[PDB]
Structure formats: C-alpha cells, structure tokens
C-alpha cells in the first residue's frame, strides 16, 4: 500500500519510541526505589526531564533542515540516544552518572525527534492521497513501540533490574540504527538539501559541541529544578513579551495555552496516576496479575485502537474543545472511582483506570495529534520555538501538580492515600472542565478569526 521507505521509517520510529518509553515508564519508580528520592523529588525531577526532552525537539529539525541533513541527523540522534540509554544502565554502577545520562537522552531525543516525520513526508509526491493514512500509521508506530515498552519494561526491571532494562532500551536504538543502515538503500533520493552535499565538518563540530554543552546544562537543570523553574519562567515571560509586541496568531496563542493545560494533564500518567495505580488499585485484571506500573501502557493501547477509527470519522477550535472535555472526564472518573467505588481496604477496580486512560487518550487524539499541525495552519520559527517552550513549561508545571499527590514512604494504608488522590484528581477535573467551557464559549470567535 505504501512506498518501500515508509516501512523503514515505520520500524525505525517504533524502535526509537520503544527505547524512550522503556525509560519513561520506570523512571519515577527508579527515582523513588533506586535513588531513594521522595515521591515529591521524583515527580519534579521527572517533570524537569520531560520538559527538556520536549523543549529541545525544536533544535533537531533545524539541524536536519539546515546544518547536516535529515538522514545524517537521524543517524546522529540515534547514536546519541543509544549512548544515553547505555549510560543510564551504567548509572547503576556509577550513580553519579544518572543526570548526565538523562541529559544525553534529552539531547539525543532533541536531535532525533523531528527528523523521521520529515523524512516520511518526502517519501510521497506532494499531493499523494496516502499521506494522511501514512501519518496515521506513523502515529500507530509510535504507540506500538510505546505499548510494548510500557507493558514490558517494569516487568523486566522487576525480574532483572534496571541495568538490563536500560541496556535493552539501548539495544532497541541499536536495532533502529541497523534497520536504517540496512534499508539506507531505500532512501537514496530522499532527504533535505544538506543530505546531498558532502558533510560540513565545521557544522558537525558545532553540533557536537553544542550537544555536549547541552547535555551538561540539562544535567544541571534536572539536578536543580528550582532554577529550571526560573529559566523557564523568564524565558516564557520574555517570549510572551516579544510575541505580544509583534489576528490569526492570536488564535495560535490561545490554542497554545489550552495545549499547555493538556500537557500538564498528560504529565500525570508517569507520576501521580502511576502511583495512584500502585497504591489504590487492584493489581489483577481478567484474572491475571500485572505490574501496576504497566498500567501506563493503557495510553498507547487505546491510541492504537482509536486512531484508525477516529481517522475514519467544529473543525479546529471545537476539536481542541472536545479533547479538553475528554481530559476533564478522565480525571473526574479517577476521583469518582476513589470517592464512591473503592473497597473497604481502599482499593478500586482496575476497570476504572482502564476508563480513565480511554478518556485521556481520546483527549490526546483530539489535541496533541492536531496541535502544531494546524497551529501550522495559522502561521514562524518564533512560534515553533515558543510552541516547544510552552510544552516544556507544561511538563515542569505537571511535575509540580503531581507533587500534591506525593505520599511519604512510611505510609502503608490505602485509606490514607485514597483521599489525597481523589481530592487532587477531582480538582484537576473540575479546573479542566471550566477550561473546556471557556474554550467552548470562544469556539465561535476563534472560528471566525481563522477565516
């Protein structure tokens, strides 16, 4: 159905995302159990890590377009990522490496992320009808990798330890590189312009130098979230000032702030919703015992099922509005499950969490699948930088919000943790419902401005 390079890109992306989500799924627990962080420390450090992972995506597209070439930067990004995963595995011998290792993942992700999609875009003549389907399959590829990693990495970490888990993340990147190299022959005429001139070693060195500096800056920021806060605050207020000085951009701005709320909520899945599953949900479904950390896999699961269907099935501000209502319902369901449908011992049915994750995934399919894609319909470089910046700010904020559910390590009674989770998830759901209502009210004005 698709060009041959489509399938190479499908599987390269699958394996890269497998490595990344293998880390994401276990990181907060790794912080708590292996490094002895409190749940509060773990949640804010995860927020800082995710913020860097996302905020740096803007750099790799520029590097791929204008410095080294799309295909070259795919290779470089994959190699830096694999190095980062093996460094995380080494951090169990050398704990002092951990932040540098996470910084290497962040930078590797920053270099890599934008480039497979760009490459896939060049596999099709410009108005090919199959593009839409191909990008939906591309999204499924992401979520297939994520589904496997989030399912299996906690199980592996429980049975063999974190060193093996992280080394397997590295191995997944290694085989992403091998399939790229083996299929390199399929994309000989595909690339950005620098791909077809010989590589500038001047620019390669600038990219390696900047990458290394960035790895150390990321390590520092993740270690000192209290100044990462001020960096992103001053960066946000400043870029806000310079956006306000410089009416379709007004639509881009309002949609960007709503996306901020969405990413704040997405950030709860590896932190507060993860520990809610650990502490207040039964760890058995359909008669099988499972690792509760594996519940994070319900996000890619539902996406994998719903992306074809919803591809088969208003317009922009209303699609955003619908997604915000979905997210609101995910957190209201979590709160309701804890308030009314828990056991005498404080444990709730995992079917409630299956439904929580359905709501959050539908929100994702309406909002983030369709965010900078049709923010690109309103618009340049300034807004790409600000988009990734604001989503980074969202992840920092999300870590902070998660800290309201943090549980001291001496608590052992689920009836003590249940009201903390229910209070916070209920308040998140109510605030997000209000945000959805203000969104609904502005949908007509937004839809006019888009004309």
């Amino acid at each position: 159905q698709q060009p041959r390079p489509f399938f190479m890109i499908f599987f390269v992306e699958l394996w890269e995302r497998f490595g990344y989500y293998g880390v994401q799924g276990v990181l907060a627990v790794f912080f708590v159990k292996q490094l002895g962080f409190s749940q509060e420390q773990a949640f804010v450090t995860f927020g800082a890590f995710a913020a860097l992972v996302y905020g740096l995506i803007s750099i790799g597209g520029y590097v791929g377009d204008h410095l080294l070439g799309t295909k070259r930067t795919i290779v470089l990004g994959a190699l830096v990522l694999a190095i980062g995963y093996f460094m995380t595995g080494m951090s169990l011998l050398k704990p002092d490496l951990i932040f540098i290792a996470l910084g290497t993942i962040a930078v590797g992700n920053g270099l890599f992320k934008a480039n497979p999609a760009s490459l896939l875009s060049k596999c099709y003549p410009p108005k090919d009808p199959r593009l839409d389907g191909a990008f939906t399959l591309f999204y499924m590829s992401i979520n297939i990798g994520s589904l496997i990693a989030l399912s299996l990495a906690p199980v592996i970490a429980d049975r063999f330890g974190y060193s093996v888990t992280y080394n397997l993340c590295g191995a997944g990147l290694i085989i992403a590189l091998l399939v790229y190299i083996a299929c390199r022959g399929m994309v000989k005429d595909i690339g950005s312009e620098p791909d077809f001139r010989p590589m500038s070693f001047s620019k390669l060195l600038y990219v390696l130098l900047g990458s290394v500096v960035m790895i150390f800056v990321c390590a520092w920021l993740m270690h000192n979230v209290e100044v990462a806060n001020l960096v992103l605050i001053v960066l946000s207020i400043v870029v806000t000032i310079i956006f306000f000085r410089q009416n379709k951009m007004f639509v881009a701005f309002v949609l960007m702030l709503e996306a901020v709320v969405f990413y704040i909520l997405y950030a709860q899945m590896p932190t507060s919703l993860n520990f809610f599953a650990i502490n207040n949900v039964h760890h058995e479904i359909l008669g099988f015992s499972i690792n509760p950390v594996s519940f994070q896999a319900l996000n890619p699961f539902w996406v994998v099922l719903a992306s074809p269907i919803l591809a088969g099935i208003l317009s922009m501000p209303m699609k955003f509005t619908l997604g915000m209502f979905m997210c609101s319902l995910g957190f209201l369901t979590a709160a309701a499950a804890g308030m009314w449908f828990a056991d005498a011992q404080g444990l709730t049915s995992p079917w409630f969490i299956v439904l929580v994750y359905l709501f959050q995934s539908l929100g994702e399919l309406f909002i983030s699948a369709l965010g900078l894609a049709m923010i690109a319909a309103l618009v340049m470089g300034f807004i790409l930088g600000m988009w990734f910046l604001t989503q980074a700010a969202a992840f920092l904020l999300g870590g902070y919000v998660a800290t309201f559910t943090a549980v001291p390590d001496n608590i052992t009674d689920p009836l003590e943790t249940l009201p903390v989770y229910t209070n916070v998830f209920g308040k998140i759901g109510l605030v997000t419902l209000g945000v959805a209502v203000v969104m609904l009210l502005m949908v007509p004005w937004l839809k006019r401005m888009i004309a």
Partner: nanobody
Amino acid sequence: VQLVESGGGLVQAGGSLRLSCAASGPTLSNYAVGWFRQAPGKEREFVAGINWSSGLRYKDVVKGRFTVSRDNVKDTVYLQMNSLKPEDTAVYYCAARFGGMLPLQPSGYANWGQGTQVTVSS
C-alpha cells in the same frame, strides 16, 4: 511470584519463633510483604507487614511482640515472633503486593506462600 515461607514450628507460651519469606525470580525489594494467619475456624487475617521502603503495619494484638524486618541482601523478609501465646496458633502465610501499601485483606495481594504451621502450647 512464588514465595517460600520457612521457620514455623511448635513452641511453648512465652517463647519465640522466626518466620522467613523469600521470593524466587522477582526481587522482593519492590514488594510490600504482609504476614497473614488463619486459626482453626476463622478467616485469614492480616498480622504484620513491611512495604517496599521500610514502612511497617501491625495488627493491634501483636504490637510490642512481633517485629517485621527486611534483609535486602538476602532478598528476605522476616517475622520475629516473641512472647508467643496460645491464641497465636495458626497457619501463617506471607503475601506480596508491589509498592508501598499494606492492604488489610487477602485480596490486596497477588502472590502467596504456601503456609507454615505455628503452634503455641500452654
């Protein structure tokens, strides 16, 4: 996923016994281990436990007599039973649940040892 209990037995009132729980494949370090006991003609009841990060929980009638502790080198959890009394006679089970919580009912725990008879004679 399968726990081995060891260390039960017969003891006189006022004596002591030590139970131990060890896991096979999975590292017990990620698990809250609760000790349950079933006396003749009653249901399994929570006795004592330790979560994955040294939090402790106890039934009222064993406070000041039982101690749960954890040896993370041997990947073993221990229940040290002092000042034993006849009504402590029961089959004892260790049970393991991932994470920091020690729920009170058997249904909160997926993994179970086979049970060790503890008898306290007057």
